[PDB]
Design a protein around this nucleic acid. Structure first.
Lengths: 92, 176, 63, 77
RNA sequence: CUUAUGACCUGGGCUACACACGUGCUACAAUGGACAGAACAAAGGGCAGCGAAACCGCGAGGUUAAGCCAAUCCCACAAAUCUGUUCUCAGUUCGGAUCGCAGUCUGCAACUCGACUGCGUGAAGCUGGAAUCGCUAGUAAUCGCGGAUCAGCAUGCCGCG
């Protein structure tokens, strides 16, 4: 898929894109505005042009693949450095 | 083809000259690739045995075997002769096509693929995996995919040492 | 090869969104793909985006 | 503090400057848990008064983004 | 009791929870969720205080500053509600708690220790056991508004519609 994760085919593009971690409401709407799709369309009914548009937009922007690692790195850092905040994190 | 000529013309001569073998066919060769499914979850889902059998036929036309328990176990609620997992042996153009498909789609399709395990060399010269996702490459029909458990793949080579097997795999394109 | 126990193998042209074409004997007559080997950044050597974002923190002393 | 600048106590900053002008040396005791960690704090094994004792803590690079109280617990159990 | 059961100061605790129970708020959705347009308020406060208007910023808010010791000016464009677009019965376009990051109000400093905003997720939860509570008219239910305590802190209090 666009971000390597399947999206609902029977839903609007706006909310279909939200199922990707890191890409929420504002990010999805901004990507749709950049792509020029009007935000009212089915994802099962699209063409290669606007598909590749969103694909390259996502590849240029941040993705779950990077966020999953960045958040984990930050968490491990703030846990290892002491950081009573990090202590609470480890405690859960 | 697209792999046999590449091998015979780049991997064999280069590796032979690199390792200073005393004969032409002394170069290590990939004998076969065995794919296994491992599951005894069939105990709780008798139809689970059907799963990964229709998927394996699409992954490779070679129909898998319904391997059966060679020994019973109470901890797993097992009895000798009950079906557990599936087996497939690719030898010939099938293994070449499987390697091509894998390298071209499966590894690049994985979301978080980076620096595959270096550990999973046998010591002996074989290389061993358990893909944990059942929808790695396109022939698995994401829509029809219901269960998510991937496949064991076992690469077997005539290499006498792990070092030469590593070199062969890297020259073939294994992104270590 | 047994008779009829296996599906018919067919040569197909594996396609990619970036334009790379690969050929492999597959059940499907054609296979559409989005990320091929070269398309995946790991195969592109040191990826630009990753090599650019992989820098360590500097305490954010810009301000 | 958002744009007024980072935060630190004057006496603690003067102590750290005196200790860093020549070479990092023995612990710098202080009761200023409020102070925020700066790059200058690196290498100095500062001590924090948790209420009944001083806990010496070696401030590494990544500590700049936290306060001394984050490393000076107070409650007991 | 008294060179201490009195007094000064830094920090901590008063805010810890395998727990149980009173009171209140939010939820489990189609009388609904999100977006576009529109109307009506009643009471109270303002001098180191209240602060129009303009600009900046998605935002909480920041800068210049009019006016007001007040039936003048401001706080302060009430929301429910209505007319439309849209989704569709699902742990969901329900709920936003816990949560990571980035910021805003204040203040020497929100780290033990406020609130608020954006980002990305999102569970518990789909009506809840004995039993129990308030309510006879502008009452019940329910939607907003202002003040006390206050540098900065309200689901509680006082009242108003």
């Amino acid at each position: 898929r666009i971000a390597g994760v399947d999206i609902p085919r029977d839903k609007r593009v706006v909310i279909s894109l939200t199922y990707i971690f890191g890409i929420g409401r504002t990010t999805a709407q901004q990507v749709l505005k950049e792509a020029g799709v009007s935000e009212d369309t089915r994802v099962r009914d699209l063409t290669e042009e606007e598909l590749g548009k969103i694909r390259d937009i996502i590849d240029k922007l941040k993705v779950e693949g990077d966020l999953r690692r960045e958040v984990s790195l930050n968490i491990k850092r703030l846990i290892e450095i002491g950081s009573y905040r990090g202590i609470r994190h480890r405690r859960g | 083809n697209r792999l046999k000529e590449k091998y015979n013309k780049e991997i064999a001569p280069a590796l032979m000259t690199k390792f200073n073998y005393d004969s032409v066919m002394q170069v290590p060769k990939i004998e076969k690739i065995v794919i296994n499914m491992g599951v005894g979850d069939a105990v709780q889902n008798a139809k689970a045995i059907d799963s990964a059998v229709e998927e394996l036929t699409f992954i490779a036309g070679q129909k898998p075997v319904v391997t059966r328990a060679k020994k019973s176990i109470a901890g797993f609620r097992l009895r000798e002769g009950m079906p557990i997992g599936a087996k497939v042996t690719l030898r010939g153009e099938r293994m070449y096509d499987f390697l091509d498909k894998l390298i071209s789609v499966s590894l690049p399709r994985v979301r978080d693929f980076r620096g595959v395990s270096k550990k999973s060399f046998d010591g002996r010269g074989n290389y061993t995996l358990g893909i944990k996702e059942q929808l790695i490459f396109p022939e698995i029909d994401y829509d029809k995919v219901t269960k998510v458990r991937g496949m064991d793949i076992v690469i077997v080579t005539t290499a006498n040492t792990d070092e030469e097997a590593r070199e062969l795999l890297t020259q073939v394109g294994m992104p270590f | 090869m047994k008779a009829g126990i296996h599906p018919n193998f067919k040569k197909a042209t594996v396609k990619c969104a970036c334009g790379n074409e690969f050929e492999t004997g597959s059940v499907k007559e054609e296979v559409r793909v989005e990320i091929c080997s070269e398309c995946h950044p790991f195969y592109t050597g040191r990826q630009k985006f990753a090599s650019a974002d992989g820098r360590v923190d500097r305490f954010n002393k810009k301000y | 503090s958002l744009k007024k600048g980072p935060f630190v106590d004057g006496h603690l900053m003067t102590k750290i400057e005196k200790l860093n002008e020549t070479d990092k040396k023995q612990v710098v005791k202080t009761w200023s848990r409020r102070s925020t960690i700066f790059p200058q704090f690196i290498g100095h094994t500062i001590a924090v008064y948790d209420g009944r004792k001083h806990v010496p803590v070696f401030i590494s690079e990544d500590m700049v983004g936290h306060k001394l109280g984050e490393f000076a617990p107070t409650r007991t159990y």
